[PDB]
Amino acid sequence: DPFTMVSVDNTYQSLERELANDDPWRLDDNPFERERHTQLLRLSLSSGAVSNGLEIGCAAGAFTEKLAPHCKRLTVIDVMPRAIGRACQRTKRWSHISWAATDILQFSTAELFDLIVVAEVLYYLEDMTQMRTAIDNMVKMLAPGGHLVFGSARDATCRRWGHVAGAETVITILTEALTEVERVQCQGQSADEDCLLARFRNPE
Ligand SMILES: Nc1ncnc2c1ncn2[C@@H]1O[C@H](CSCC[C@H](N)C(=O)O)[C@@H](O)[C@H]1O
Incomplete structure (x- = not known):
């Protein structure tokens, strides 16, 4: 069926617009987003407590808040400063969270993480060469036994949204x-x- 979404000139403005909503992406109020988060957290916790976790793309902190109590240390990156601002207010009781306003394409750490969560973010990149670059970066930052938990809208849905690729492709x-x-x-x-x-x- 046909649908309507907000229309902007670039992905920055798209992000900035959603982050100015009371509930960005409806991640709190949508039962589907709550169920998605339940699955995302179930997968993240499959191996018990995490030593050094990375969350890539945090919106207003809805998932950060669910993940934080289960990681000894948590790092969170987001290309949008407004996302860092909203999320760190949400998770303020925790003293073990680090943040960086950076694009995953530009993020370089010597840090290795035993969990990387990358959900509903990689389709904002412009093309497949950027996705591969970001993926290589994520692989490189995985600890020798660590897990990566990925989630995404499907390819078809992503293409309907104007993006290049989604779940199956990644x-x-x-x-x-x-x-x-x-x-x-x-x-x-x-x-x-x-x-x-x-x-x-x-596998390492
Ligand atoms: N290239 C990029 N690098 C890092 N963060 C990005 C990014 N492109 C988009 N984002 C961020 O990714 C987030 C997507 S909303 C998804 C949030 C969370 N992972 C969840 O599943 O609920 C937003 O905070 C947006 O600002």
């Missing part, structure tokens, strides 16, 4: 460097609410 690329340990589908009320999540292990 899973394919992820699989060249990493070992798939599990996956889950997540479906809501419409074609737009149809998500694939997969948990990958670093």
Whole structure:
């Protein structure tokens, strides 16, 4: 069925607009987003407590808040300063969270993480060369036994949203460097609410 979304000149403005909503991306108020988060957290916790976690793309901190109590240390990156601002207010009781306003394309640490969560973010990149670059970066920052928990709207949905690729395409690329340990589908009320999540292990 046909649908309507806000229309902007670039991805920065798209992000900035959602981050100015009371509930960005409806991540608090949408039962589908809550169920997605349940799956995302179930996958993240599959191996128990995390030593050094990374969250890539935090919106207003809805998932950060669910993840934080289970990581000894948590780092959170987001290309939008407004996302860091909203999320760190949400998680203020925790003293073990670090933040950086950076694009995943530009993020370079010597840090290795035993969990990287990358959900509903990689389709904002402009093309497949950027996705690969970001994926290589994520693979590089995985600890020798660590897991990567990925989630995304499907390819078709992503293409309807004006983006280049979604879940199936990224899973394919992820699989060249990493070992798939599990996956889950997540479906809501419409074609737009149809998500694939997969948990990958670093064969290392
Ligand atoms: N290239 C990029 N690098 C880092 N963060 C990005 C980014 N492109 C978009 N983002 C951020 O990714 C977030 C997407 S909303 C998804 C949030 C969370 N992962 C969840 O599943 O609920 C926003 O905070 C947006 O600002």
